[PDB]
Design a protein around this ligand. Structure first.
Ligand SMILES: O=C1C[C@H](NC(=O)[C@@H]2CCOc3ccc(Cl)cc32)CCN1
Ligand SMILES: O=C1C[C@H](NC(=O)[C@@H]2CCOc3ccc(Cl)cc32)CCN1
Ligand SMILES: [Cl-]
Ligand SMILES: [Cl-]
Lengths: 305, 301
């Protein structure tokens, strides 16, 4: 029993974290095979960040301008290139701790574990979701750039996020490992704001199933709803639309608990219209949306890596 | 910026997790140097669960009755001994992945990361607090026994918990790595209940300081309180007494935010009286108590 916000075991990623220094800036890099990936803004001064021409800033750098440290060992940089907003530093040594990995771009609503790092040293691991507005509600201080987000599927690490910046509201923005930003953000010190966010409906439903599995049923009711009537309610309360794909994805949890997806939607509609009435669900007075249906199944079944 | 429930990176502990089998039972072990630590109840059969005589059950076992698997390699058990409720299996190979470590027994209110494991394989990492009633609100299924709790301040892993059992309310009980249970629990399936749990007051105050550091001040007020008046009110909401030790511990956070500890206590008294009125504090509609003063400073600074 119990239901916790759980991250993947971070060991496979810890063995890839390195420190990258370019001039006065130090941030984190991800060392996989003979390449170290890091945010391209590592080459910027504070003034350059106002309006950077990354090609112009990069052409002026030599390999020796990048200092890469893996633990207490210096990695020799033998090449450098840019891919979108990520800098790729070719090093003279393949990482012997390179796990089986892939680079995957995730969609809003998908969750992943973040290994927060400072000076190439992992400091913490936490689970988060890619918000519908393409930000993540992370926990990052100065020096955390280059920290990565990932999932594990069997023994393969799927890297999905690299940290680049914090927006004025305290939320975070970054890219996939191919350097493409999630959201309409740019790597520049300019006025940028996260758009109005919405709740990840399919994830709230998955967490309501987790609550039922854990013995919390007070919110269940005799009612059902149509997908169109539910979506009219979801739009009203800034919840993301629930698609037939989401309904299909929740099928296994619906079969396990005996609560149809549209039956659980009727519980959610009532919760949105009435509140919790002083009650909690899984120790929360808010509807949690950072557990996917796969996370709930994995946690309530015990999948290992 | 941001404030998340954050666990320590689990890699150093993942390299220590092994599978221990004794007869029909399989659970997790912690392999450090040439010793594998696991719950002594791994030697119990279905008839031993209520009143096991562990000394009597253990004397009947030979080294080859314990199968220890580290990855796809069987380690050879060359000795065994019991220390309180933990079984220590001497193996023929020192773990090459043994990190710098220590065993620490923690106090209620302390937090730690749990690496949940099944069949010697890590499945997830989460953050826990040792509740005032000496249970933990973990997430554990059958096969999770032997999973450990730890902290990693610097490069040294301090192991503080080994999972043994789940109580009827769905909360968890275990021991330190010397095999001493936290709380009045025993490794017997006899009727056991967690005592009434309470909120970790010092941790709630630490988290209110974290909220102020992160830019939120809506809950502050122009009042202060005496420590005794605060305790009289807080106990009515099932909050733990706040001691002068706790006030002293919150000193650094008080100096950083400019909010005196007893001033923050008055905010807490008001929150207990009024609730949040549709507002949240650090993305929560409840008062969070599983961040210690040390956690807040580490995460914010
Ligand atoms: O999550 C974090 C990282 C954050 N650092 C940035 O946001 C840098 C410096 C500011 O100006 C910018 C502007 C753009 C870019 Cl890509 C990065 C940055 C410091 C606080 N925590
Ligand atoms: O992970 C689990 C949990 C549970 N295991 C116990 O109940 C053990 C069995 C042996 O006899 C005992 C005796 C005492 C104690 Cl604390 C535990 C136990 C059922 C099987 N799986
Ligand atoms: Cl599924
Ligand atoms: Cl302690």
């Amino acid at each position: 029993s119990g239901f916790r916000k759980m991250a993947f075991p971070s060991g496979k990623v810890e063995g890839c974290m390195v420190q990258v220094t370019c001039g006065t800036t130090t941030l984190n890099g991800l060392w996989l095979d003979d390449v170290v990936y890091c945010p391209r803004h590592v080459i910027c001064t504070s003034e350059d960040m106002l309006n950077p021409n990354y090609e112009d800033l990069l052409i002026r750098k030599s390999n020796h301008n990048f200092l890469v440290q893996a633990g207490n060992v210096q990695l020799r940089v033998i090449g450098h290139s840019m891919q979108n907003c990520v800098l790729k530093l070719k090093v003279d040594t393949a990482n012997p701790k390179t796990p089986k990995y892939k680079f995957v771009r995730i969609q809003p609503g998908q969750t992943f574990s973040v290994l927060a790092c400072y000076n190439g040293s992992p400091s913490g691991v936490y689970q988060c979701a890619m918000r519908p507005n393409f930000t993540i509600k992370g926990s990052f201080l100065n020096g955390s750039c280059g920290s990565v987000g990932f999932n594990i599927d069997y023994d393969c690490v799927s890297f999905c996020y690299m940290h680049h910046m914090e927006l004025p509201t305290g939320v975070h923005a970054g890219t996939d490992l191919e350097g493409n930003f999630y959201g309409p953000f740019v790597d520049r010190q300019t006025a940028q704001a996260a758009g109005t966010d919405t709740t990840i409906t399919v994830n709230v439903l998955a967490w309501l199933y987790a609550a039922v599995i854990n013995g919390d049923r007070w919110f269940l009711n005799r009612f059902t709803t149509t997908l169109n009537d539910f979506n009219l309610v979801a739009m009203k309360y800034n919840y993301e639309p629930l698609t037939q794909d989401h309904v299909d994805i929740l099928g296994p949890l619906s079969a396990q608990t005996g609560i149809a997806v549209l039956d659980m939607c009727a519980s959610l509609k009532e919760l949105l219209q009435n509140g919790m009435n002083g009650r909690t669900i899984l120790g929360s007075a808010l509807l949690e949306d950072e557990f996917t249906p796969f996370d709930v199944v994995r946690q309530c079944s015990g999948v290992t890596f």
